[PDB]
């Protein structure tokens, strides 16, 4: 049986949304396996690295030009397993695609962060990308532990504890306060891996923002 | 370690903890305890952002509006991810000040005739500009 | 510091003092107000800064304001404003009245309803 | 089941549940009486027999009566008389009230 070389998610806005297109040896075709739970969508999203699977559904075919043939094996995958290579597949046989429907999948935008307002980077206001928008992080709880996690992710070195005397050189923000009550205990790898309140809910003002100055 | 914090309000300085004590040995005869700790200010006034407001000598503490959850949570349904409303009940008065917050005011300053309004710090230290 | 208890009994006038201490250098600017109305430069006095015998390098000064006995008995408010370079916002203010600052009694009322509500 | 406290807090009505299980065969009749006087059939809604998935051969149902908040607060009593052939006297009763519960205590401390 063919081994998937990759997934591309064509016919969708960007490459984190669209129709599931398994790369068959040489020419590739669309797949409509039954029991398409979110577990397989999570592995599909992890193939591209977009982020977390949010939704999967099969859409009615009304002159959608589904020229791509269909596969002949199932892909029962536990979701916590590795790439599509390491999940069992049926021994060829017939297809489970009775109703002619395309499989849809909706991944999420990847995370990103930066410092704005500081010279030669490694300093300034904190902006985090989510839902395709940048925003500020509240300073209600900003311990020294929460400062070093941001610094190493951008490779700016250990923070030098600049206090608030030089934190007035960046000013306030205008964007939405995405994060609040951030509590980072361990190093982890990303700020999103910490415990926060929620995306979009806060009790802060643009005057109270977070400024992080690393070594550089 | 044996107590779990439910609410940690700062405006009303209210804190509620619950704990189960293994009294006797029958599992059906263990008491459930609810502790409430309230600190009331005797010098703060009606409006904490206006020094001219009169003094406050009446405090009301509703426990139904204190132990309330108002933040959508994520729920997995094996086919999608949705946001769920915790409560349907969701202008509250702040009795005391908050350390994590800054309180400022506008005051007229006269000198040689000209009047320059300047931002003040009602709180002793709080945060810095 | 509020006016003395045995000064109000004569029913002549009341004196309020604003003590500012622990600062360097020795240039301060103290202005009195009454419920948002700047007061006249004549009703209050101020003294030049003097060294503190206990801790060298920190100074102090005070401003004295007089008021009518009936005006203070009514319950009007007064504010003390000081300008110095050391402050974060460079200006601070404090407020006193009859009900706050060495009072006679304390009247409190407390209500605790919905004590058996849903917590979850 | 005593009525929900939050439902009473919002002050519209109250919900009284009569949960009866563990009878065989499927033959049950529940009624609602107040102060020894049976209530009208238009006061409660009666469910239907349906098997219990856990233990085969057992059926169960329930009945709910809505009461006014003031009527519930005034201290009126309610009961759920049940009839079953397997019962000794063919009549069994369970009764609850506002006072139905366990006595509580109040260790109030005032630090002047
Ligand atoms: C308590 O004081 C605040 C501050 O004076 C009042 O809100 C202010 O109202 C003025 C106009 O009257 C605005 O210029 C300010 O922007 C307001 N403050 C804020 C933080 O927005 C408030 O209304 C007072 N409360 C009561 C009950 O009088
Ligand atoms: C009353 O308070 C004491 C501590 O002051 C505590 O030991 C005791 O358990 C309290 N009473 C009840 C009924 O909880
Ligand atoms: Ca803050
Ligand atoms: Ca917060």
UniProtKB/TrEMBL annotation, chain D:
<protein>
    <recommendedName>
        <fullName>Ig mu chain C region</fullName>
    </recommendedName>
</protein>
<feature type="domain" description="Ig-like">
    <location>
        <begin position="1"/>
        <end position="97"/>
    </location>
</feature>
């Amino acid at each position: 049986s063919p081994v998937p070389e990759g997934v591309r998610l064509a016919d969708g806005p960007g490459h984190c949304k669209g129709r599931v297109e398994v790369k068959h040896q040489n020419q590739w075709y669309t797949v409509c396996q039954t029991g398409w739970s979110l577990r397989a969508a999570k592995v599909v999203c992890r193939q591209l690295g977009c982020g977390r699977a949010v939704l999967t559904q099969k859409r009615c075919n009304k002159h959608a030009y589904g020229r791509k043939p269909i596969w002949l094996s199932q892909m029962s995958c536990s979701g916590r397993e590795a790439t599509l290579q390491d999940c069992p597949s049926g021994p060829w046989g017939k297809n489970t695609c009775n109703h002619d429907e395309d499989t849809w999948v909706e991944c999420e935008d990847p995370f990103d962060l930066r410092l704005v307002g500081g010279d030669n980077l490694c300093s300034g206001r904190l902006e985090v990308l989510h839902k395709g928008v940048w925003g500020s992080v509240c300073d209600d709880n900003w311990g020294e532990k929460e400062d070093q996690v941001v610094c190493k992710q951008l490779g700016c070195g250990k923070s030098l504890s600049p206090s608030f005397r030089d934190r007035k050189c960046y000013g306030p923000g205008v964007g939405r306060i995405w994060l609040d009550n951030v509590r980072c205990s361990g190093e982890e790898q990303s700020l999103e891996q910490c415990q926060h309140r929620f995306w979009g809910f806060h009790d802060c003002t643009h005057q109270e923002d977070v400024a992080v100055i690393c070594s550089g | 370690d044996e107590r779990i914090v439910l609410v940690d309000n700062k405006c009303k300085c209210a804190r509620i903890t619950s704990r189960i004590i293994r009294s006797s040995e029958d599992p059906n005869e263990d008491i459930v305890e609810r502790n409430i700790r309230i600190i009331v200010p005797l010098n703060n006034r009606e409006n904490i952002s206006d020094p001219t407001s009169p003094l406050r000598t009446r405090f009301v503490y509703h426990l139904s509006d204190l132990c309330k959850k108002c933040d959508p949570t994520e729920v997995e349904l094996d086919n999608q991810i949705v946001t769920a409303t915790q409560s349907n009940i969701c202008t509250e008065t702040c009795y005391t000040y908050d350390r994590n917050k800054c309180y400022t005011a506008v005051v007229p300053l006269v000198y040689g005739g000209e009047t320059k309004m300047v931002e003040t710090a009602l709180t002793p230290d709080a945060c810095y500009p | 510091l509020p006016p003395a208890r045995e000064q109000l009994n004569l029913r002549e006038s009341a004196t309020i003092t604003c003590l500012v201490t622990g600062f360097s250098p020795a240039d301060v600017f103290v202005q009195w107000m009454q419920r948002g109305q700047p007061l006249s430069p004549e009703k209050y006095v101020t003294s030049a800064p003097m060294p503190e015998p206990q801790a060298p390098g920190r100074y102090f000064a005070h401003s004295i304001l007089t008021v009518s006995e009936e005006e203070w008995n009514t319950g009007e408010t007064y504010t003390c404003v000081v300008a110095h370079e050391a402050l974060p916002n460079r200006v601070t203010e404090r407020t006193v009245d009859k009900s706050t600052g060495k009072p006679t009694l304390y009247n409190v009322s407390l209500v605790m309803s919905d004590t058996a509500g849903t917590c979850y």
